[PDB]
């Protein structure tokens, strides 16, 4: 769950957009994977390998 | 039985804490309406028999089966009970309107009315249609000037209609 490693205003517009039925599951997952949260957790602390 | 002033205090004792200033200007503004609210309840209690009889007459001109022989509205006593069941809900809606909170409405009027009407075989949907027809006449009668200063009362008639819909969904 995200709430221990985010402030709260990072993926809010992505959540509101999916709850309204504007984006599919795949678009929400794609937008989720290219957020600043994913960059901070699984890209910055590790090597590319 | 609570009024709207009682409700914030009953939620303030629970946390054991003083009312902050935002709750206080929420309450002074509410008070500052004040006269409008009692103008509303004055208009409903001045015309209560007319509301009830016109709603019942529209109900039976609409649904003739209740006064058909064998209907639930049959017999001199069952019509007399149906006449002022509606007047009971009108009385408790006016109590909840003057209180600012639907605490007297839930506690003595709508508490256990559903299985009361189930145990008698009374169709609760027709009671709800009667409640809706009393509601329409009450909000129609509420927003006329009739010698009152001109202003907006919209947030009060929305609450008055909300009490009627709360009564209508709880019966059925």
């Amino acid at each position: 769950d995200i709430s221990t490693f985010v402030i709260g205003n990072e993926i809010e517009n992505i959540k509101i957009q999916f709850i309204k039925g504007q984006i599919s599951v795949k678009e929400m997952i794609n937008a989720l994977g290219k957020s600043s949260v994913y960059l901070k957790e699984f890209y910055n602390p590790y090597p590319n390998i | 039985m609570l009024d709207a002033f009682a409700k914030v205090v009953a939620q303030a004792d629970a946390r054991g804490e003083f009312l902050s200033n935002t709750q206080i200007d929420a309450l002074s503004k509410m008070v500052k309406e004040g006269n409008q609210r009692l103008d509303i309840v004055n208009k409903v209690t001045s015309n209560a028999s007319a509301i009830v009889t016109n709603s019942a007459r529209a109900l039976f001109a609409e649904q003739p089966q209740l006064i058909q022989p064998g209907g639930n509205a049959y017999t001199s006593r069952r019509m007399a009970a149906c006449l002022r069941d509606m007047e009971i809900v009108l009385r408790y809606v006016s109590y909840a309107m003057i209180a600012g909170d639907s605490s007297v409405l839930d506690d003595r009027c709508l508490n256990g009315l559903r299985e009361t009407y189930q145990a008698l075989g009374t169709p609760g949907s027709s009671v709800a249609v009667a409640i809706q027809k009393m509601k329409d006449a009450s909000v129609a009668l509420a927003n006329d000037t009739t010698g009152t200063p001109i202003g907006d009362c919209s947030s009060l008639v929305a609450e008055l209609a909300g009490y009627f819909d709360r009564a209508a969904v709880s019966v059925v």
């Binding site: - | 089966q65 064998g70 209907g71 639930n72 009407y117 169709p123």
Partner: protein, 132 residues
């Protein structure tokens, strides 16, 4: 058999009710009325109470003395480790060897840890089957 509870027999209100406004009657029993709850028998000689004559205070620690087999066999066992026990005590007392090397723990802590069990070290042997 009988009409539902409360309903006066013969004057139901759902008699000629239309099907488009008929309401199903919820079932009601006498389970919650006070007269229907089961009492203790107590005429068949069954009082469901508790009082004197059912109190028991059994001792579990010193319930009363222990068997003769355990006693005789403890005396037996004690007549078996006595020689080796006194020999071990004798080996401990006069085994007053000196120390060597810089103390690691206060003034003690020299080459040997005190009271280390030697059978753990010397009791595990490297064996070569078909030895060299």
């Amino acid at each position: 058999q009988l009409a539902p509870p409360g309903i006066p027999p013969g004057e139901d209100a759902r008699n000629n009710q239309s099907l488009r406004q008929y309401v199903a009657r919820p079932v009601e029993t006498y389970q919650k009325r006070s007269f229907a709850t089961p009492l203790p028998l107590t005429w068949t000689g069954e009082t469901e109470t508790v009082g004197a004559f059912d109190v028991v205070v059994p001792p579990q620690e010193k319930d009363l003395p222990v068997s003769g087999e355990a006693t005789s066999a403890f005396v037996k066992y004690s007549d078996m480790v006595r020689a080796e026990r006194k020999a071990a005590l004798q080996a401990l007392l006069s085994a007053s060897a000196a120390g060597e090397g810089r103390p690691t723990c206060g003034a003690e802590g020299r080459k040997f840890v005190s009271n280390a069990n030697p059978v753990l070290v010397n009791g595990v042997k490297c064996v070569e089957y078909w030895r060299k």
